[PDB]
Amino acid sequence: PPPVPLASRAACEALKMVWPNAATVVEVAAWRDAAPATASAAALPEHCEVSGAIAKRTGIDGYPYEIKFRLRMPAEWNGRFFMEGGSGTNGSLSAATGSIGGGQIASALSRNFATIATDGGHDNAVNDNPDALGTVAFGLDPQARLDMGYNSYDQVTQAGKAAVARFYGRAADKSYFIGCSEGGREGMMLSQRFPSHYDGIVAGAPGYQLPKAGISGAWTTQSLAPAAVGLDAQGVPLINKSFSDADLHLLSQAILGTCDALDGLADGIVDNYRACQAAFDPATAANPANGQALQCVGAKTADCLSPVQVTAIKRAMAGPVNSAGTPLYNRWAWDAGMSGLSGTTYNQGWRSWWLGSFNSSANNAQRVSGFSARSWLVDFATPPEPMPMTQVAARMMKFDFDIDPLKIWATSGQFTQSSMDWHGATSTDLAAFRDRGGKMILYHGMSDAAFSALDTADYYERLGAAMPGAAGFARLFLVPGMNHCSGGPGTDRFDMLTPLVAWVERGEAPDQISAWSGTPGYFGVAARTRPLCPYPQIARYKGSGDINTEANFACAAPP
Ligand SMILES: [Ca+2]
């Protein structure tokens, strides 16, 4: 160790030291003065910023690969270590101040944690191959797949903790990981594959079966095509034209008409999501505004949905099956956040995934021609299937559910692990994690069109069965109305870090988590706060008082 004061500029610059991975190169080790708050970020304390890369190499596609990291260690340190999760197919290196999600302004660094981030083992500015669908092109390299699946977060966690020990002269007392989406998958993977890396984990909207997302995507694309109107430049139906924003709002209003009050309170929120799934069928549901059937009896009017539309969304929500009827992913919850109107602005946060923007002459859904479909083809199918960007939608339209779904379990050539092997995080063996004191908070918006909230619930049910008493270390918070990680007519904003630290360090399990709406105009109000309830509980109004105030609600079993 350098004979210099700990936690100082001197100790920072001396990191540019033996690393757990001999192939670690530090490119930056710089002292940063305290930064004031901005409109979008809390103030950052004085700190050491360390950035570099691990395992620089050349892939079998001829491209350069490395695991980049950025670490920030505050001079005034609370003894805790924090890693933030990724997003999408990763490939970018964030500012690494420790995002906590939930629409929060504060970062973990602003709360005096040491914080770290990674790009997951590839770089969107370098591994952008125009012959292999752009920034998903890292899928052409077998090791870059393993790095994306698990290896990068492992290497960066070890490197960050080694830097922390050198800079401060002691290890962190407790370590925390927070991620949403791909980041939620990472958090579940860590609890399963690397249980001693983190003591507290928050996994939001976790893509723990991400290789199956493109299977759902082909299925929702083919389900919706009969309701499409018009064609894109490649002659493929415009899936975005299958439902206007007004059409989706009608569907959302019919869901509310059937389902809103099944929790006891008409408030634009379906808290009793299980009762909703048992009750709602758009082929038989009424439009509550006039009592007529939601499904048109004759020609299409602005107050009804065509039979073709109703068949299409019903099929899409049912989930993919093979020709023998076996489910290949899961079903999706009917929920009011499939739409929403705030002022004159329709919610886009559900429809962007399977349909895309209505006002476009091209397909732009994530699952039709977008990043999710591209990622399935190049990253999760084995062997990879690179192709022109203009062929992706056609490939989804021609997807064969007896043949193509098998490719996420296959190996081939140098791809010696399947994508479900390296990217899936489906194990419920959390004994090692639980026994060392680990705590996990899962959350998921009911109107998430990327990953099914009901599939997260099914994982949690399997966890509870495998490990009796699981609510002692792992709880799931479902959020009615919320879309993918944020947005929608629900209480989508919350501070998950504060209850996580309370659970890990004071044993105080979260019996509720306070939340508020980022867009309370969806309900025509200035603010709405509600408790998030641990599965299977839901929020129950006490029977009087302002329905927009959390104090008038409690968590309870459904009616
Ligand atoms: Ca309600």
Author numbering: 40 to 55, 61 to 428, 429A, 430 to 603
Which passages does the manuscript contain on this structure?
PETase cleaves BHET to MHET and EG, and the soluble MHET product is further hydrolyzed by MHETase to produce TPA and EG. Overall, the structure of MHETase is most similar to that of FAEs. The structural conservation between the hydrolase domains of MHETase and PETase is striking, and despite the large insertion of ∼240 residues representing the lid domain, residues Ser225, Asp492, and His528 effectively reconstitute the catalytic triad.
Of note, they pointed out the importance of Phe415 for substrate binding via an “induced fit” mechanism and highlighted Arg411 with respect to hydrogen bonding of the MHET carboxylate group, both of which are proposed to be drivers of substrate specificity. The only other amino acid with side-chain positioning correlated with ligand binding is Gln410. When Phe415 is in the open position, the side chain of Gln410 pivots toward the active site to a position wherein the heavy atoms would be as close as 1.8 Å to those of Phe415 if it were in the closed conformation. Given the observed dual occupancy for Phe415 positioning in the crystal structures, we simulated in triplicate (each simulation 150 ns in length) the four combinations of Phe415 position (open and closed) and active site occupancy (empty active site and MHET-bound). One of the MHETase disulfides is located at the active site, connecting cysteines (Cys224 and Cys529) adjacent to the catalytic residues (Ser225 and His528, respectively), which is conserved in tannase family members. A similar Ca2+ binding site was characterized for Aspergillus oryzae FaeB (AoFaeB), wherein it was hypothesized to have a role in stabilizing the lid domain.
